[PDB]
Amino acid sequence: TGNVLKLKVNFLPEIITLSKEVRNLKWLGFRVPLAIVNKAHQANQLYPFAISLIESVRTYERTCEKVEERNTISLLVAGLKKEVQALIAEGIALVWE
């Protein structure tokens, strides 16, 4: 069911591994290839946006539960639905943005 887009932090399964391995080789004096260093540290600095994305995913789950709380939510929640549409477009439907 559903067959739609989703909003969940996707940087998390690799940014900590890249940070630990690359930064450990750095303070270990060892070297890591150019693209790995750049993309790893940039993904780690982008991890704050991924943190906001994880909190937004939790907020999306709580939003579904709150929209499924009782009667008047699903009856008169078109404003929150349009807001969730614009939010899903600005954060989940980003094509290289």
Partner: peptide
């Protein structure tokens, strides 16, 4: 926003 997310996915294609 299920249909909205589906519309966004179809618009991105």
């Amino acid at each position: 926003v299920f249909l909205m997310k589906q519309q966004s996915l179809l618009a991105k294609q």
